[PDB]
A paper describes a structure:
JH binds to a hydrophobic JH-binding pocket located at the one end of the elongated structure near the C-terminus of α3. The uptake and release of JH are regulated by the opening and closing of the α1-helix over the JH-binding pocket that functions as a gate sensing the ligand entry.
The MPD-bound JHBP adopts a gate-closed conformation which is similar to the structure of the JH-bound JHBP. The refined model contains four JHBP monomers (A, B, C and D) in the crystal asymmetric unit, which are related by 222 point group symmetry. For all the four JHBP molecules, we revealed two bound MPD molecules, one (MPD1) in the JH-binding pocket and the other (MPD2) in the second cavity at each end of the elongated structure. Comparing with the JH II-bound structure, the α1 helix of the MPD-bound structure is folded back into the hormone binding pocket about 11° and generates contacts of the Leu17 and Thr21 side chains in helix α1 with MPD, which is smaller in size than JH. In addition, MPD1 is further stabilized by CH-π stacking interactions between two methyl groups attached to C2 of MPD and the aromatic side chains of Tyr130 and Phe142. MPD2 is partially solvent-exposed, and is held in the cavity by a water-mediated hydrogen-bond network with Tyr116 OηH and Arg189 CO, and hydrophobic interactions with Ile60 and Phe62 in β2a, Ile101 in β3, Tyr116 in β4, Ile159 and Leu161 in β5c, and Leu185, Leu189, Arg189 and Ala192 at the N-terminus of helix α3.
Author numbering: 7 to 174, 183 to 222
The structure:
């Protein structure tokens, strides 16, 4: 069902609604599964020390079906979109904490329960079908990680036991950066799906 140009509140729901309905995928439309969302790997540099690298593998992320689109601005002369969200993400994956300057690494599992608030911005333009029908075309966006709330992080006990036995923010800052990096991959994926719906439906569809 269409919105009426201008009504920002109408949109957020259409999107949330799109995200939930399609969130497990639809290959033929290039709509990616985003709940659960799988990230093959993601690397993260310690902000307080570039010799320290967190290597995530197999991140499995749930929660994105349900995120709220709590703010939605479409500017028509500049043709750009600002939008804010919150997701409660449950994250699980393999982790390798790599201390490059010490020639060692520690391995195990990682789990993070966090509520993330962010901002996606992109511009867009109008463009035609082969039949001359107009679609929106959404352009490469940027993602700003506005906050991560107060995360719960757990390390598998083999790892946390290895860490303790070795040392027997940077913290804050490192924990923050990992969540933001992960949130960022999450939203590259969200917007991919927004971008994809825009290919699947005439611009006319999205407003009255
Ligand atoms: Zn794609
Ligand atoms: Zn909502
Ligand atoms: Zn939770
Ligand atoms: Zn078309």
């Amino acid at each position: 069902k269409p919105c009426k140009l201008g009504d920002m509140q109408c949109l957020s729901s259409a999107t949330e609604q799109f995200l939930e309905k399609t969130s497990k995928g639809i290959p033929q439309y290039d709509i990616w599964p985003i709940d659960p969302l799988v990230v093959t790997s993601l690397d993260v540099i310690a902000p307080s020390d570039a010799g320290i690298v967190i290597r995530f593998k197999n991140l499995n992320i749930t929660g994105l079906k349900n995120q709220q689109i709590s703010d939605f601005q479409m500017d028509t002369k500049a043709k750009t979109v600002l939008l804010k969200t919150k997701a409660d993400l449950h994250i699980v994956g393999d982790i390798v904490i790599e201390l490059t300057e010490q020639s060692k690494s520690f391995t195990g599992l990682y789990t993070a329960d966090t509520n993330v608030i962010g901002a996606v911005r992109y511009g867009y333009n109008l463009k035609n079908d082969d039949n001359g029908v107009q679609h929106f075309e959404v352009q490469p966006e940027t993602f700003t990680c506005e906050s991560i709330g107060e995360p719960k992080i757990t390390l598998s006990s083999d790892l946390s036991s290895a860490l303790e036995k070795d040392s027997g923010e940077p913290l804050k800052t490192l924990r923050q950066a990992a969540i933001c990096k992960i949130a960022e991959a999450c939203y590259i994926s969200v917007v991919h799906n927004i971008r994809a719906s825009a290919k699947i439906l005439p611009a006319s569809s999205f407003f009255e």
